[PDB]
Symmetry: D2
Subunit: 116 residues, 4 copies
Amino acid sequence: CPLMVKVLDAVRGSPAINVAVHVFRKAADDTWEPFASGKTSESGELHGLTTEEEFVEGIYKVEIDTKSYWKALGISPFHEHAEVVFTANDSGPRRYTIAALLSPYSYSTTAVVTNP
Amino acid sequence: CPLMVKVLDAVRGSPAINVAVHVFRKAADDTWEPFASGKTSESGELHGLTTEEEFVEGIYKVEIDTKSYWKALGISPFHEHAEVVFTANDSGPRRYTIAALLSPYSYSTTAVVTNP
Amino acid sequence: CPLMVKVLDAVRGSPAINVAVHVFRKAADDTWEPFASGKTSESGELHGLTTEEEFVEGIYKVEIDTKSYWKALGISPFHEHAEVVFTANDSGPRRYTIAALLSPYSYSTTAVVTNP
Amino acid sequence: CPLMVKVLDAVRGSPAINVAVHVFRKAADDTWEPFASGKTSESGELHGLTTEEEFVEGIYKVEIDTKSYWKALGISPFHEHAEVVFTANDSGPRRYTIAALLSPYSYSTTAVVTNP
Ligand SMILES: O=C(c1cc(O)cc(F)c1)c1cc(O)c(O)c([N+](=O)[O-])c1
Ligand SMILES: O=C(c1cc(O)cc(F)c1)c1cc(O)c(O)c([N+](=O)[O-])c1
């Protein structure tokens, strides 16, 4: 699994479940073409977005719909979304976990990049 | 000063100086119009981007050029940039500090919103 | 597994491997009695610290030896360690993951608390 | 002002006001001696804890009473407190800002260290 997204909730101390996640790849004309999407599981994880053949070098964007998550919990959020943009596979294919820790007025994001 | 951006370096425990910051506002036709730009000072802060009169209700995007900051230190970081997108002033005028704390493979961002 | 500790490295974008972790429980005379210890695995995780019978209600401390980790990488750290202190099981037993995301001059820590 | 502590609330996007902070210094016999204390102001900042002359080289501990902050807002948070332990001034006098960004089940902390 070359790309996994994990989302955590810092208010409740839990996985952030049912969070919508959309992934894009930058096109040659600098626009964002859709690539994959899903919703986080009960563990806060979204697996199966891509395959190693399809996940070529490129610039990728992961947009996490944080606003809808907080609205569903009845909590006022600051951000419209949380976006993570990164160049992938520049030194060979890697396994990427993009993690985000959400609070209503703040988020943290990190990448765990491992070599299979 | 209705909008201030502050950037910190979590590796050195310092302000992140000379970081380029570009601010955009969403126009009525859903495109991103350039709104203001600048670079962080020796304190890691960027003041003077806008005025109370100009900073009307809207959806704003703050793009922080984190990649160039790390590259100038010899580091190839994970993220292309850090973007913060938020609705401003929808309950009346507020003062916003948008802060980002940078590491090569992670960042955190928070908003401090006050009512003068 | 009632208690797991996970440690990530925000500089390298990786699990933080071989990090020493010590766990204590607060004694009746308000001193910290040793409870368990280990080192993080190649996945940054430390499992098997306790059992559900032994992990009774109480105040627990997890001390993560961040300074030794950064020294082993040749990077100057700020903190002596990262400590997490929390009351456990106050509403019944839970499964706790204590996670820490490390940078040389900053860390983040969160708890993911789930009900089996 | 050689030591300043700043506390922010990631739920409301605000300073964390009236947070108690206690500072200790490690004595030659390895015990923690009380050094200074105070509470955060309306800006979330606590100034005036020490002076350049008194703030000698040593190992310092800053304990932030995060639990009482959340409890006064009706919340039972995960952590009992947030502690930050660090060696100060070992390369000569520096100015330290110790910041903490609080959520009910998570916190981040960073140090900004400057040379006047
Ligand atoms: O990114 C993080 C993370 C972010 C922070 O701000 C603070 C922190 F302690 C961890 C993370 C990544 C993972 O892969 C993961 O499993 C977990 N977890 O389970 O708790 C967390
Ligand atoms: O956003 C933060 C911040 C982010 C984190 O991950 C952890 C933390 F403790 C603070 C911040 C904001 C500010 O306005 C500010 O002055 C400072 N500071 O000087 O240190 C920091």
